[PDB]
Enzyme design. Structure first.
Site, PDB file in Angstrom:
ATOM      1  N   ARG A  14      39.433  57.640  72.033  1.00  0.00           N
ATOM      2  CA  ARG A  14      40.117  58.878  71.876  1.00  0.00           C
ATOM      3  C   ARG A  14      41.578  59.022  71.490  1.00  0.00           C
ATOM      4  NH1 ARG A  14      43.539  54.899  75.155  1.00  0.00           N
ATOM      5  NH2 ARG A  14      43.422  56.243  77.323  1.00  0.00           N
ATOM      6  N   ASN A  68      55.493  57.533  68.793  1.00  0.00           N
ATOM      7  CA  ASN A  68      54.271  56.429  68.715  1.00  0.00           C
ATOM      8  C   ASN A  68      53.564  57.362  68.478  1.00  0.00           C
ATOM      9  OD1 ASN A  68      51.871  55.350  70.139  1.00  0.00           O
ATOM     10  ND2 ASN A  68      53.235  54.864  71.880  1.00  0.00           N
ATOM     11  N   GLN A 122      56.979  53.213  67.394  1.00  0.00           N
ATOM     12  CA  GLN A 122      56.341  51.577  67.800  1.00  0.00           C
ATOM     13  C   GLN A 122      56.512  51.478  66.444  1.00  0.00           C
ATOM     14  OE1 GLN A 122      52.398  52.919  66.897  1.00  0.00           O
ATOM     15  NE2 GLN A 122      51.882  52.630  68.575  1.00  0.00           N
ATOM     16  N   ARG A 128      53.657  56.605  82.171  1.00  0.00           N
ATOM     17  CA  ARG A 128      52.880  57.170  81.073  1.00  0.00           C
ATOM     18  C   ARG A 128      51.986  58.534  81.433  1.00  0.00           C
ATOM     19  NH1 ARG A 128      50.174  52.721  78.654  1.00  0.00           N
ATOM     20  NH2 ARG A 128      50.162  51.924  80.427  1.00  0.00           N
ATOM     21  N   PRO A 129      52.319  59.693  81.271  1.00  0.00           N
ATOM     22  CA  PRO A 129      51.618  60.932  81.363  1.00  0.00           C
ATOM     23  C   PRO A 129      50.063  60.129  80.816  1.00  0.00           C
ATOM     24  CG  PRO A 129      53.391  61.335  80.469  1.00  0.00           C
ATOM     25  CD  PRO A 129      53.733  60.337  80.305  1.00  0.00           C
ATOM     26  N   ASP A 146      50.397  47.042  73.530  1.00  0.00           N
ATOM     27  CA  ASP A 146      50.531  46.998  75.441  1.00  0.00           C
ATOM     28  C   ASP A 146      49.202  46.849  75.716  1.00  0.00           C
ATOM     29  OD1 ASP A 146      50.420  49.264  73.263  1.00  0.00           O
ATOM     30  OD2 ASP A 146      49.248  50.139  74.819  1.00  0.00           O
ATOM     31  N   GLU A 189      38.178  48.791  67.237  1.00  0.00           N
ATOM     32  CA  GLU A 189      39.917  48.866  67.504  1.00  0.00           C
ATOM     33  C   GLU A 189      40.231  47.496  67.486  1.00  0.00           C
ATOM     34  OE1 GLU A 189      42.498  49.934  71.235  1.00  0.00           O
ATOM     35  OE2 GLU A 189      40.743  49.506  71.432  1.00  0.00           O
TER      36      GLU A 189
END
Ligand SMILES: OC[C@H]1O[C@H](NC2=N[C@@H]3[C@H](S2)[C@@H](O)[C@H](O)[C@]3(O)CO)[C@H](O)[C@@H](O)[C@@H]1O
Length: 507
Positions: A112, A156, A167, A237-238, A272, A456
């Site tokens: 993503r 970011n 960031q 946050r959008p 986050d 990740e």
């Protein structure tokens, strides 16, 4: 560039809230097929009409975003082969795309994450450099320099919805990395952009009084200057719209805008989300990022100041070099006073609400070693804390608290592995450094042997499984995992006998 919640106003909110797509990031990355003003007027006419279908309206009006190793492919080969897969080239973008243009190709994390990210890129660049792709390293530094000049800071990532924040600041370290190949020419070349980024972090220091905060700057009651994470917006946050609305709704004892600011600022922290920012580890709605002075950020600011001194000296500007050393020295004193927990014996964040050093040990505590700010006694204490509390069979734990968030136990993240290893090396703690590297690499290899991919984050309680937690699923690729793995693979085998898979026996 206006972020999508503004550009597409009520329609954006409505599409997100409808949960038409299982990831809120999906519609944040939608590209309008025509002028948003036209789309909005059309929507206003249709939305209350009998039989209106929002999903069909979206399909008409927007374009939405769009491998297995060969048999016996080694870990190293897989990583090398994936770079082009993870590389994107967006010199120009269609009109009203949330993706922001960059002058050179760039590596994205994967999945993503279909845009460049700031701190990820450093660790990705370490891998690109290790594998001789210095052209790509140079391209990345150029991209970030461009962002500094264009926006005043590194967002970011290169999306409109990230312009409100940055960031963890690694640009100065990116320039230092490039100088490992190009020499001091690289430091001198990018000195203007390093200084401009520093101006961003420090914006607000002018006229700031003791005990005050402004943007990313905090001045403690004794005048000590430190930084915090801080987003310029106080709205959902959008890219995580419904999540953030739900988080704020769940805690009516706090103003929603304060929760949104703190959610956004935790995104700016890279972490986050985490118990690190939370009064209650089981309730994200208690996070208070902007009231916490982070030990990692301030270690990175110290390094930035040191690198600015080094670049200034190289350039022949001695007054600026001296000024930056003076700034670094002040920063170091601040870190040692306010970001060291002497009761527990580890580095930690400082709490602007209680005016006390926080108690929690997290992997951020290795950052003072990573940047050579730490006193040697404190570095040795950190080696002990690491072995006692954070080193697990599959790598360095992010925290000791299993909160359900991703920056927490039992997850290990590549960048934290590398920061820890390198920090420990900086103070001669080679055994603990090698155990972190070997344990994490074993995890990466085992997971690759089973799943034929890198991911990740990893569950460090064992080896061979990816981590989880938080608001989206484990992602695959994965930029900084790949980069750190290459660096560590070089540390663990001779190089007169380099390894392409992590061996079962230490050479
Ligand atoms: O789910 C939306 C969030 O997605 C990103 N969050 C995270 N992504 C990975 C972690 S947490 C972060 O430190 C790295 O940049 C990351 O590996 C890739 O984006 C983004 O940085 C945050 O700003 C977004 O709000």
């Amino acid at each position: 560039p206006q972020p999508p919640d503004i550009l597409l106003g009520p329609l954006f909110n409505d599409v997100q809230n409808a949960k038409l797509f299982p990831d809120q990031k999906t519609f944040a990355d939608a590209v309008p097929n025509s002028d948003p003003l036209m789309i909005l007027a059309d929507y206003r006419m249709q939305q209350n009409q009998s039989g209106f279908d929002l999903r069909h309206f979206v399909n008409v009006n927007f374009t939405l975003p769009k491998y297995v190793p060969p048999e016996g492919q080694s870990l190293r080969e897989h990583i090398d082969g994936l770079w082009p897969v993870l590389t994107r080239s967006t010199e120009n973008t269609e009109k009203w795309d949330s993706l922001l243009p960059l002058p050179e190709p760039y590596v994205v994390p994967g999945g993503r994450f279909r845009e460049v990210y700031y701190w990820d890129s450093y660790f990705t660049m370490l891998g690109l450099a290790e594998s001789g792709h210095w052209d790509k390293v140079a391209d990345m530094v150029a991209n970030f320099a461009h962002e500094i000049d264009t926006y005043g800071h590194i967002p970011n990532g290169n999306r409109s919805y990230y312009l409100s924040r940055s960031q963890p600041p690694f640009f100065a370290l990116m320039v230092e990395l490039l100088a490992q190949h190009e020499g001091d020419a690289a430091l001198k070349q990018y000195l203007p952009q390093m200084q401009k980024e520093y101006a961003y972090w420090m914006d607000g220091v002018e006229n700031l009084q003791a005990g005050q905060q402004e943007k990313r700057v905090v001045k403690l009651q004794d005048g000590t200057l430190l930084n915090r994470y801080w987003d310029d917006r106080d709205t959902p946050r959008p890219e995580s719209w419904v999540e953030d609305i739900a988080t704020a709704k769940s805690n009516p004892n706090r103003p929603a805008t304060e929760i949104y600011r703190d959610l956004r600022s935790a995104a700016a922290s890279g972490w986050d989300f985490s118990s690190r920012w939370m009064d209650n580890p089981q309730q994200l709605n208690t996070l208070r990022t902007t009231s916490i002075v982070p030990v990692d950020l301030n270690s990175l600011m110290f390094k930035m100041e040191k690198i600015l001194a080094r670049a200034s000296k190289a350039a022949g500007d001695n007054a600026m070099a001296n000024q930056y050393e003076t700034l670094a020295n002040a920063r170091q004193k601040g870190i040692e006073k306010y970001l060291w927990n002497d009761q527990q014996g580890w580095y930690a964040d400082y709490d602007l609400k209680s005016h006390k050093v926080r108690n929690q040990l997290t992997a951020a505590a290795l950052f003072p070693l990573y940047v050579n700010a730490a006193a040697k006694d404190r570095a040795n204490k950190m080696a002990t804390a690491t072995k006692t509390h954070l080193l697990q069979p599959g790598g360095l734990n992010t925290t000791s608290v299993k909160s359900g968030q991703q920056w927490d136990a039992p997850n290990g993240w590549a960048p934290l592995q590398w920061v820890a290893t390198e920090g420990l090396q900086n103070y001669g703690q080679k055994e603990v450094a090698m155990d972190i590297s070997w344990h994490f690499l074993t995890n990466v290899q085992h997971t690759y042997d089973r799943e034929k991919k890198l991911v990740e984050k990893y569950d460090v309680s064992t080896t061979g499984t990816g981590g989880g937690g938080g608001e989206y699923p484990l992602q695959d690729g994965f930029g900084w995992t790949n980069g750190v793995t290459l660096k560590m693979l070089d540390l663990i085998c001779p190089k007169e006998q380099p390894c392409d898979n992590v061996p079962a026996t230490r050479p």
